[PDB]
UniProtKB/Swiss-Prot annotation:
Name of the molecule in the record: Papain-like protease nsp3
Signal peptide (from-to): none
Organism classification: Viruses, Riboviria, Orthornavirae, Pisuviricota, Pisoniviricetes
Species in which this protein is naturally found: Severe acute respiratory syndrome coronavirus 2 (2019-nCoV)
Shown stretch of the complete protein: 1564 to 1878 of 4405
Effect listed in the UniProt record for changing Y268 to G/T: Reduced inhibition by GRL-0617
Swiss-Prot/TrEMBL catalytic activity: Thiol-dependent hydrolysis of ester, thioester, amide, peptide and isopeptide bonds formed by the C-terminal Gly of ubiquitin (a 76-residue protein attached to proteins as an intracellular targeting signal)
Length: 315
């Protein structure tokens, strides 16, 4: 007896493609690698319960290639498989609402993702790939599994792998519209004089070397090519936020002087992130866990600040 069912294939879970599959052959033999809501069904034969369901496949013809690029803005051949592999895990995570924000209950070393997600909900940022637009909208509403699996895929991290918050934000910023953001800096060495620089996009909102926005405005010491120490300060800033980052160090966070921050305890091979947010008071969100305090001191590694337009008074 020849038996078939109708299923749909997809690469973006919006555009569907009608298929008839032989129930005597695996999905793999018929589609190549195939996934059902993140589960790898390549080696599985069609079941009656599969009729009418949507399966993800890899882009193996020009129509799927165009749909996949339009939705994800990547042509990395292994992207969809990495996204499905992650999703199969993230759909099992819990996403509690903590002080009004979608968080993530700790699992699989996902603390860096929780503090990244919590941060995104506090800064003005629009993503460019539809995949991120759609999944972030769902994440804000509490259903963050697809958004987390996409972050993992875009950052080329697997579930359980140790992640860095600054690197993760850089990847997400790369897929955001930051074209309006601009930064002017001035570098002063006593032997070589001055040199001003202009930064755009992601580079205009990220800085590595100091956590304090005020000190960035007043000046920071860096090496110069002659062996002297030069000073660098912020001349002009046009952006809706800024992100200041540094190797983890004991740092004091004062209520009302920043938006949110990341705290890292541990070492370079393993550790743990927490998120600090400045609301009526300082709240520390550690996945599902919430505590409060009037003042905060701890090993901070990233601080986010609101911004619209800043121009220095320094001459
Ligand atoms: C085979 O797997 C993938 C293919 C692509 C697309 C759209 N490539 N298309 C061109 N290179 S023209 C994107 C992600 C994948 O996972
Ligand atoms: Cl898991
Ligand atoms: Cl968005
Ligand atoms: Cl403290
Ligand atoms: Zn010099």
């Amino acid at each position: 007896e020849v038996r078939t069912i109708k299923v749909f294939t997809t690469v973006d879970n919006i555009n569907l493609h009608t298929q008839v599959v032989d129930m005597s052959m695996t999905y793999g033999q018929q589609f190549g690698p195939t996934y059902l809501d993140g589960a790898d069904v390549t080696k599985i034969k069609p079941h009656n319960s599969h009729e009418g369901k949507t399966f993800y496949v890899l882009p193996n013809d020009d129509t799927l290639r165009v749909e996949a690029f339009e939705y994800y803005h990547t042509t990395d051949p292994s992207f969809l498989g990495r996204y499905m592999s992650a999703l199969n895990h993230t759909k099992k995570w819990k996403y509690p609402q903590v002080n009004g924000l979608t968080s993530i209950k700790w699992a699989d070393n996902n603390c860096y993702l929780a503090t990244a997600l919590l941060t995104l909900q506090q800064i003005e940022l629009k993503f460019n790939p539809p995949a991120l637009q759609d999944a972030y909208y769902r994440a804000r509403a509490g259903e963050a599994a697809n958004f987390c699996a996409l972050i993992l895929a875009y950052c080329n991290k697997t579930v359980g792998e140790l992640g860095d918050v600054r690197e993760t934000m850089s990847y997400l910023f790369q897929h955001a519209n930051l074209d309006s953001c601009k930064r002017v800096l001035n570098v002063v060495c006593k032997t070589c004089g001055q040199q001003q620089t202009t930064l755009k996009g992601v580079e205009a909102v990220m800085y590595m070397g100091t956590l304090s926005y005020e000190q960035f405005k007043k000046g920071v010491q860096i090496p110069c090519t002659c062996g002297k120490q030069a000073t660098k300060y912020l001349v002009q800033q046009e952006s809706p936020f800024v992100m200041m980052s540094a190797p983890p160090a004991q740092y004091e966070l004062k209520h009302g002087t920043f938006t949110c921050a990341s705290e890292y305890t541990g070492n370079y091979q393993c550790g743990h992130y927490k998120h600090i947010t400045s609301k009526e008071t300082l709240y520390c969100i550690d996945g599902a866990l919430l505590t409060k305090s009037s003042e905060y001191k701890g090993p901070i590694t990233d601080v986010f600040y609101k911004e619209n337009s800043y121009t220095t008074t320094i001459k």
